[PDB]
Amino acid sequence: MGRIISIVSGKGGTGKTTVTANLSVALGDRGRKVLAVDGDLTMANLSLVLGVDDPDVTLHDVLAGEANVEDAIYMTQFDNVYVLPGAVDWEHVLKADPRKLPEVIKSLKDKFDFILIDCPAGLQLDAMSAMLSGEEALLVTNPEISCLTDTMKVGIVLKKAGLAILGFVLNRYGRSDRDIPPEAAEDVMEVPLLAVIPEDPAIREGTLEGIPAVKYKPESKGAKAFVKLAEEIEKLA
Numbered sequence: 058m059g060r061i062i063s064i065v066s067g068k069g070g071t072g073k074t075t076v077t078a079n080l081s082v083a084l085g086d087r088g089r090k091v092l093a094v095d096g097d098l099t100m101a102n103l104s105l106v107l108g109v110d111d112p113d114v115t116l117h118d119v120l121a122g123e124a125n126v127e128d129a130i131y132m133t134q135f136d137n138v139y140v141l142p143g144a145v146d147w148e149h150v151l152k153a154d155p156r157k158l159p160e161v162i163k164s165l166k167d168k169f170d171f172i173l174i175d176c177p178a179g180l181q182l183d184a185m186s187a188m189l190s191g192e193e194a195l196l197v198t199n200p201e202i203s204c205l206t207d208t209m210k211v212g213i214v215l216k217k218a219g220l221a222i223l224g225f226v227l228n229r230y231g232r233s234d235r236d237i238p239p240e241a242a243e244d245v246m247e248v249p250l251l252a253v254i255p256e257d258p259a260i261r262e263g264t265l266e267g268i269p270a271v272k273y274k275p276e277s278k279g280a281k282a283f284v285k286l287a288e289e290i291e292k293l294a
């Protein structure tokens with residue numbers, strides 16, 4: 058295949074990393090070879106959430122012209138799920154040219170069915186460099202108003218950029234009484250509502266565990282909701 062999807066959001070604290078990880082494990086669970094990429098150069102976190110603790114070679118090394126991206130790809134405890142991890146030390150952050158992300162990531166378009174990029178929130182250089190590395194985009198958002206709005210903005214900036222907006226994800230729903238319902242928030246974003254990820258403590262349990270919820274606690278609500286998302290994402294092709 059070769060679908061490079063960018064997991065993005067306009068605000069933050071929305072659950073981009075959670076989505077990237079659970080979705081990855083979900084797709085890989087359906088026989089799809091997937092590469093989870095950590096595009097948050099300033100605060101690497103994706104690999105940790107995926108159980109890959111101390112990688113020697115990271116995306117930062119590659120973006121610094123220090124290593125070939127092929128040596129920054131690691132196996133994870135999950136089937137068909139590989140990760141392109143990011144370093145955390147400051148020096149690495151500095152020497153990592155975010156502008157090379159698109160060329161680096163797209164050079165992997167033929168070795169995976171899906172390349173899911175975890176993108177840092179915002180429109181700054183790092184965020185932009187990351188989001189603009191994908192061909193498709195998955196908007197992640199919370200049932201908040203200021204959130205649903207910004208995220209929507211970002212959707213267009215990327216649509217104008219040439220990325221195909223696949224739709225959004227309403228994450229954390231059922232967290233508050235004042236949470237915007239589904240269809241409502243749907244005819245607001247103005248893009249298909251691909252899935253509703255409930256506020257489930259199980260998702261947080263998976264995070265700390267280093268084993269995405271969809272796999273760690275299979276029967277949980279969050280787990281099932283992500284498996285469906287997997288189906289919805291696959292259908293879009």
Ligand SMILES: Nc1ncnc2c1ncn2[C@@H]1O[C@H](COP(=O)(O)OP(=O)(O)CP(=O)(O)O)[C@@H](O)[C@H]1O
Binds near residue numbers: 070075
């Ligand atoms: N639907 C949900 N129910 C319960 N907890 C959830 C959740 N979605 C995300 N979380 C939890 O909320 C925290 C923040 O999620 P996440 O790490 O994915 O955010 P993010 O990647 O968008 C942050 P940042 O902007 O810094 O990149 C995590 O600890 C995660 O386990």
Ligand SMILES: [Mg+2]
Binds near residue numbers: 097175
């Ligand atoms: Mg994150």
